[PDB]
Structures are given as structure tokens and as C-alpha cells.
């Protein structure tokens, strides 16, 4: 089961076409599954073209020899998910899954709301300082977020995490955490989060003075 | 009857589906592989009928209208005979 495309980005109302190639078809049975953010896998299609219960009719499957394809017409934001083809074949049975296809649903560009959080008093007493910068509800996913401490950009001591695309509104959120020792944190004054994103009219900087 | 369920689970009756469909389109080894599979049920008439029932069950999606259903059901009923196997006396294909 060789699955393609690995990545897909399409707008609502368009048609998504995913394909798998079975290596062999000895007593083969083909299915397709959907993995939404946070949710258990959901059977879409079984036996190549039969639609599972609770699945809208715009999902359909077909086969042409060794090639099996899932067609998702009239795309919705809720189709944002990872899709897997599934072959059971041979005796003793063997189950193979495709490598998966990540389907993004496009939307109108949305600038991030930028928020910054200094370290808690509790954590500082523990001997460390975590500063957090949040980008909320933006699209597209590309955004450059850096910490800038007394005008020096921080590279290698921060960690970034991005949510999966929201099923309802098709946005991402992102956190950037700078972790420092107590001693290092107190050595500097100005902590600023520098953000560029296509939805912004210019780069954004949210900052706080340490001790204020 | 638990013996029957186990061998039907391991049986591969896809060749029977393909042979039957080839046969109606007329009106290579699919038939022989099908008869090989059905030969495993010759010693239990009840299990043989269950195998034919499962072929009919799995073919409902591919059949449109009673004419197509009847045309496929006739060939399925004759399939053990065409395989040189003893057929079940009573066998409802629904």
C-alpha cells in the first residue's frame, strides 16, 4: 500500500483525490480511515467502494486494478484530518496501512492574536523562568516567532508547538516557550516576542519589562 | 456449526464472485479456484449453502434491480453443480 499524495491543501467545495497502490491483491479487501484532531479513527469506506454508516455521500471510493482511490467531493473544514488506506490480504491474514495523507482545508487569511506571559512567581521560586508567547487562531500555518532578549534573538533555547488545524474554523494556534535559569532570567530586562505572519499588516512585537 | 464459521472465515470466495460475473457478461482460473474453495464445504450441505449465501450477501451492492439479482442468483444456485460438487437441496439465497 503506497499512498499518495502525502500532503494536500484544498479549499472548501473542491474535490480531494487520494490514491493507494496495493502490491498484491490475493483475497484483498481495501478500506479508508479518517483521523480527525483528537478523535478515534473513523471508517469511511470498506471493500474499496462501500460507504460506512454515518459517512456523508460526498465520500466515495473506487478501484482500477491495483490502484484504489478515495474521492472527497464538496470539501468541508471538518475534513481537515489524516487519511489512511487499509489492505487486509492473504492467508494467514496480513494488514497493511498506507503511509497516510494529511489534508489541510484552506481558509481566508487570518492574522494571529499575539499574547505574552511572563514566568509565574511560583516557578521563579523553583529556580527557573519560562516565558510563553501565544499566537491564536491564524491561517496559513507559516509564521516566524522568535524571542528577543535585550535585542538579542534567541535561537536554540526555545521550544515551539503548533496545534492541529481546527475542524470548525480551519485555524492554527502556536506557543513559543523560552526556558531559562533563575540566574540567566534576572540577567536581562526586556523580553519581547517577535512575530511575522502574512495576515499581519506589519511584524508584531509584544514585550514586557522584567519586574513590571 | 462453529467449525463451519471458522472455515468460512478463512475461505476466499472472491474467485467465485469474479467467475460468476464473467459468466453473465458472456451471456481464466477463477472458476477452478472457486470450485477448489467450495470443495471444502462439500461434506456439509448446510455450510455449503451458507457459503453461497455469503457470496450473495457480498454482491448486493454490485447488483441493481431484480433482473440483475435474479440473473446472478440463478448462476449462484447452479455453481456447485457446475463445480462437480453436491449442492444443497434446500437453500434460500436472501
Amino acid at each position, epitope marked *: 500500500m503506497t499512498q499518495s499524495p502525502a500532503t494536500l491543501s484544498l479549499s472548501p467545495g473542491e474535490i480531494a483525490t487520494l490514491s493507494c497502490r496495493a502490491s498484491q491483491t490475493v*483475497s484483498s479487501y481495501l478500506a479508508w480511515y479518517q483521523l480527525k484532531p483528537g478523535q478515534a479513527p473513523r471508517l469511511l469506506i470498506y471493500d474499496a467502494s462501500r460507504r460506512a454508516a454515518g459517512i456523508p455521500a460526498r465520500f466515495s471510493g473506487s478501484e482500477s486494478g491495483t490502484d484504489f482511490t478515495l474521492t472527497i467531493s464538496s470539501l468541508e473544514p471538518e475534513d481537515s484530518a489524516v487519511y489512511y488506506c487499509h489492505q487486509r490480504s492473504n492467508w494467514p491474514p496480513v494488514h497493511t496501512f498506507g503511509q497516510g495523507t494529511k489534508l489541510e482545508i484552506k481558509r481566508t487569511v487570518a492574522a494571529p492574536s499575539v499574547f505574552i506571559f511572563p514566568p509565574s512567581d511560583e516557578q521563579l521560586k523553583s529556580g527557573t523562568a519560562s516565558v510563553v508567547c501565544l499566537l491564536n487562531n491564524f491561517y496559513p500555518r507559516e509564521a516566524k516567532v522568535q524571542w528577543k532578549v535585550d535585542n538579542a534573538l534567541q535561537s536554540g533555547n526555545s521550544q515551539e508547538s503548533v496545534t492541529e488545524q481546527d475542524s470548525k474554523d480551519s485555524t492554527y494556534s502556536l506557543s513559543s516557550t523560552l526556558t531559562l535559569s533563575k540566574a540567566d532570567y534576572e540577567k536581562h530586562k526586556v523580553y519581547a516576542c517577535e512575530v511575522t505572519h502574512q495576515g499581519l499588516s506589519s511584524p508584531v512585537t509584544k514585550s514586557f519589562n522584567r519586574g513590571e | 456449526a462453529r467449525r463451519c464459521q471458522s472455515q468460512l472465515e*478463512r475461505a476466499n470466495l472472491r474467485p467465485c464472485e469474479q467467475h460468476l460475473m464473467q459468466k453473465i457478461q458472456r451471456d481464466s482460473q477463477h472458476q*477452478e479456484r472457486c470450485c*477448489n474453495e467450495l470443495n471444502e464445504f462439500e461434506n456439509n450441505q448446510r455450510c455449503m449453502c451458507e457459503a453461497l449465501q455469503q457470496i450473495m450477501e457480498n454482491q448486493s451492492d454490485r447488483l441493481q434491480g431484480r433482473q440483475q439479482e435474479q440473473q446472478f442468483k440463478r448462476e449462484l444456485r447452479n455453481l456447485p453443480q457446475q463445480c462437480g460438487l453436491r449442492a444443497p437441496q434446500r437453500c434460500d439465497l436472501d
Partner: antibody
Amino acid sequence: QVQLQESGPGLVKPSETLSLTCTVSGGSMSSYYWGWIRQPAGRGLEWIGRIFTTGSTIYNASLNSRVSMSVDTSKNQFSLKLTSVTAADTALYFCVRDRRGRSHDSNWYWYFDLWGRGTLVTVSS
Amino acid sequence: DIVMTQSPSSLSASVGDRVIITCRTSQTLSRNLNWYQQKPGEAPKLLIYGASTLQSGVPSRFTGSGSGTDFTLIISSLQPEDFATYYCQQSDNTPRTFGQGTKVEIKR
């Protein structure tokens, strides 16, 4: 152009287990019957057993206690296991197709149409 | 088990001779009487199935007949390559059973 070939050790100590594998080439083994046949010093041919690709088997009753066969269609292989072997088990071991074919007279016939070249197995210490 | 007995157990014949092999069975066969030819260092080769039906590729030299418990293989005109052991075999039930073999040696 379906072909068969045996593989496995040519020497087994007595009381140990003989194991052999037949590899099918030129086409999928799926939904055909397979078997093993043995030819000892006496020159006769002894049928060992038949295995279908569901894994169901029928063995020769003399060896049934000590014989077993298994199939793996994704490797296009089936195998033979014989335990507690003695000198009596020294033989040339053939893998075969147990064909149930329809002839031009529209009737179905059973016969062994495909054979491997055979592999000698010697039982001694 | 169905016991298969062949006669002669061995014979010597010349190139061009007719060779006749009889196979008797301990029980009545319905259909699947098979004949094989095993040359030295080779696996047996199917000649005839269903008592009388020639396998594809097999030369017209070889004919089979009979029914019930009484079957015969005829090589109408022996050739040097027919040096071999010939077996009858039933596949009407399990266990499949072979005859003891008929060694055909060639006088020259």
C-alpha cells in the same frame, strides 16, 4: 510456468524434527491444494498429506501423529514438519500441486500435475 | 486405503515394442486413475488422468483404458527415452495411493 522447489536441511538427527519448505513461483498459490510426497529407498511413492490455502489439512494416518503442514500465501510457500524421525524417514521429499481441474469433457478430475525436483533428507547421527 | 497393484513389477523390452502395464485396485474407482512416468533423477511426470485422458504435451505413444478395478497403460512403440518407472495412482479419496511401480528396462 508455475514451478515448485523444495528447500530445507539434507541431514536430520534421529528423534529431531525434519522441516522443509516448498516455494511456488510463476503464479500465486492462492486457492489451490498442495501436498508432499515421499520416495524412500524402496522406490515406492508415499503420499504424506494435502493442505489447502485456508490452512486445512488431510494427513496420511501412519504419520498423522508426527506430521504437520502450514501455508503462507504472502510468501507463496507451504511447509512440512515431521517430528521424532527415524531412519525410516530417510527419503526423497517432493512437493506437489494436488490439482482439481476441469477437463475438455466438462468433468472435474484430481491429479498431481506439478512436482518439485525433490530434495533428499538423510536421517542419521 | 485403496491398494494399487501393478503388473509386471519389471520388464525388459526393445525400441519399437508394445509395452502393456496392468493396474488392479482393491476397491472400485469412480474416476481418478492417474498414470505417472519417473525417469532417473527426475520427479514423476503425469501422463494420463481419468484413466484415459492424455495430459497436454504427453506423446500419443501413451494410452490408458479401463474402469472399475482394472486399468491398463499401453506404450504402443517404446522409445529409448521411455526408460523409466511407471506408476498408477488413485485420487478418488484420501489417502492418495500409488502402485509399487513398473520398471521398464530397454533391450538393445
